[model samples]
Target: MDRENILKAVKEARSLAKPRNFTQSLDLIINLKELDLSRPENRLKEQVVLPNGRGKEPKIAVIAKGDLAAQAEEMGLTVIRQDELEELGKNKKMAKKIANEHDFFIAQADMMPLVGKTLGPVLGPRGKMPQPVPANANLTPLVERLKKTVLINTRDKPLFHVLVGNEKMSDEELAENIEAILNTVSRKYEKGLYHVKSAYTKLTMGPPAQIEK
Candidate 1:
């Protein structure tokens, strides 16, 4: 993409972003591909935001410890651990029934085989594969992060657009969330700093304005 095209994409993307409170802006677009890398990268696909960011929170089911589950519940988060599977009526048949009903599945590495065998086929194609917790990861922390964060999938074609944050949140929260999204994606495969193309910001349903560094 040429400089002009890139700038145009950024401007258009910002126009589509939902506004938030503090910054009243959406999160940053990470490694935002300007030249296009195929699939969703070719379109205005992703970004990050914070505090009840836009989109429905995926229902997460984790198979882990009791104390961890308790902590998650305290944060107004929901969790389903291995111990509770029986009570939750989770079996192969039941798992398949609720497959699309939930958003994500996270489990201990030790439980990976079980999750893969049961829900892999059901959720993998939908990009809801359960993330196995690394040895150093804390269940509570992971749950907390998921509660506030969003992982956007732009694999679909044509429109890669997603709603990051909303006018309902503080502007600062949105910006920080965007920063996190930008920072995380930059660490992944990226082209160049110039790949950002262009960016615009508006206070929810307002006319787009160029974002100044």
Candidate 2:
């Protein structure tokens, strides 16, 4: 992928985008080739952390107890404790709602079994399983990083459509974010960049602008 061409395409996309009441997220559409989507290894199941943090913060939930729970609370993160797992497990609607509301989850290493038992059914299919962290580990860095992380998967199709940034973000920032995603996806392919058939960037409701080499 050519950096200059990608940046130019981003600028063109912004200029062509029309104003909308709701904030429009800039999206990337990537076409893949020479890969068999049938094989599990050919599919992408990776997280890309944008250089400029994706123009918005991601909602996070921490499954923990004791000191770690208290720490997450002080940090203003939603903390789910072990005792509360039963209610969440039994309430199907609530369980699904909570799972959908959070962008990511972090669980106490010791509480992995209970967390899996309670929420796995709901979150597993969505591929939103919580990251297990040691009880003594600090939550600050992980939480901060989660706010910028976006999960990109190419499981169901040969194409990938995802948000790179919002309309309000600068072209340079958005271009860099797009490049970050491209770089991450490129590394997963056997042929690196050549595996990408074609890619385009556009605002949520705007037409795609071709991103060329």
Candidate 3:
């Protein structure tokens, strides 16, 4: 319910987190009661577009080149024509409005420059920089997978949050998600494996529980 409890809940629910390991893929399911805006701002501490988002299936806005556009459209993904983005680029109010309206954004072209420049003031600070992966990526598969992949902000920092399993999903589903998250964390820490200052897991609104890795 509070900040301390939020962290504690994550610690308890680590088993339900994704990637199932440290050193690589990590994801957290969170039930946030509030945001402590007073703390010093850091990228890891900021929020990105919610995945499994606040409600309904998260919608993705695809900004791609040539065929990728058609592929993205075929995948039933939404498209905001370039001109619309240009209009949104005009100011912060418009940028925030766009982000709020869309759940995810895929840069089809070298759109990051314009995205960062126009939306950076609002999005960058919010840790929602449009994801810029390879341009020729398989739009359908990638889009489908990402819908389930909520980007957790546990990179580099000592902490990460994830919903390893939710009340809606079965315990087996929870365990699978937890294992996936654990494996990711393990791989991510493989390089600086020793740098892991502290690690933990917890339930959405429960207590902290440690996972023996």
Error of 1 at 122 (Å): 1.3
Error of 1 at 155 (Å): 3.4
Off by over 4 Å in 2: none
Better of 2 and 3 by lDDT: 2
Steric collisions counted per model: 13, 0, 48
Candidate 3 local lDDT, 1-213, one digit each (tens): 223433444444544544323222223433222223244332233233332322235678776556777777788876655676677777668678767777677776577787666666876666556766566777766676667665556344445575444444433444455555444434443332343343444444444554442
Let me know the TM-score candidate 2 reaches against the reference structure. 0.95
Residue 144, candidate 2: C-alpha displacement in angstroms: 1.6
| Model 2 lDDT tens row, 5-66 | 98999988888988889989899998887888899988998877788987778888989998
Clashing pairs in 2: none
Sort order, lDDT high to low: 2, 3, 1
Task: Report the poorest 10 consecutive residues by lDDT, candidate 2.
Answer: 184-193
lDDT of 1 at 120: 66
Q: List the lowest-lDDT window of 10 residues for candidate 1.
A: 154-163
Per-candidate TM equals 0.55, 0.95, 0.60
**TM-score pick, better of 2 and 3:** 2
